Amino acid sequence: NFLAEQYERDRKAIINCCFSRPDHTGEPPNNYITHVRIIEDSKFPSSRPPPDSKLENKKKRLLILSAKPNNAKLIQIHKARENSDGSFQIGRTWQLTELVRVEKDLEISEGFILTMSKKYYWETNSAKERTVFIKSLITLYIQTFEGHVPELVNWDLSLFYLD
Amino acid sequence: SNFLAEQYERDRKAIINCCFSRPGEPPNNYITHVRIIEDSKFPSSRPPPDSKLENKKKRLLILSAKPNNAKLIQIHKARENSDGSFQIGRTWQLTELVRVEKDLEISEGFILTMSKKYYWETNSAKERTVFIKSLITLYIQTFEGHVPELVNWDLSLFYLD
């Protein structure tokens, strides 16, 4: 539950850095939804990294999901990092609509791949965290559809339940 | 394939006519349905592959929404009468649904849990895929904003075509 305190800490900093005041363009900010810590391997950013990847390759980053202030159905994905001075900054943005595939790595419990125009391989810090972020990403995606339209989605799901 | 789609439009129209067009209060709005087989000797678990034809009853599952709130969903069980009319025999609130499980060995079978368990089969594997997709996506959509920690699943892959 060190996890939960870290999450709340990150959340506050993130909203403060990036989803709270007009930016400076002087455009309003997006509304924050959720985030997750990830590890990115700069030499293997699109596929499973060799077991022997130099610790120097491993970057600490964050994925963040948010929505347009005037559009609750226009969601964005961001990649961000925490700088040494504690500030936060976003380095990449995608529209959710660019997402075409989400897959868990069968061999690495924290590994997953997001596919937009290219593939993005990332790892979470734990198996549980992978489950949570992916659930968040996919349910949010589903919620952006306008009413009943399941013809366009495909999944390997066989069990769904409430705890 | 083409037969199915045509059967599906036929059923849909009849279902709306019989159950979602007249009023006590305004009728619900139809969303979707599927044809199911129910085993009356084995209603809550996988029937023996041996189960006699006389146990097998033709039904339908229908999803609908309250006219005022598209996020208040109901599940209905119905049956087509010999005369060609349809009638609803059972209703649940979608909020009652606590589990959805595909039968891992019978590709047409699935189980829904509300207070009791209900085992049903569709007529094909593809029809199961389609209805379950509708059921779960709708459940998800009845949530405003981020969906809570409580929902769980075994998904490991998701993609658009």
Swiss-Prot record, chain A:
It comes from the Eukaryota. Belongs to the SEC3 family. Present with 377 molecules/cell in log phase SD medium. The exocyst complex is composed of SEC3, SEC5, SEC6, SEC8, SEC10, SEC15, EXO70 and EXO84. Component of the exocyst complex involved in the docking of exocytic vesicles with fusion sites on the plasma membrane. This is Exocyst complex component SEC3. The gene is SEC3.
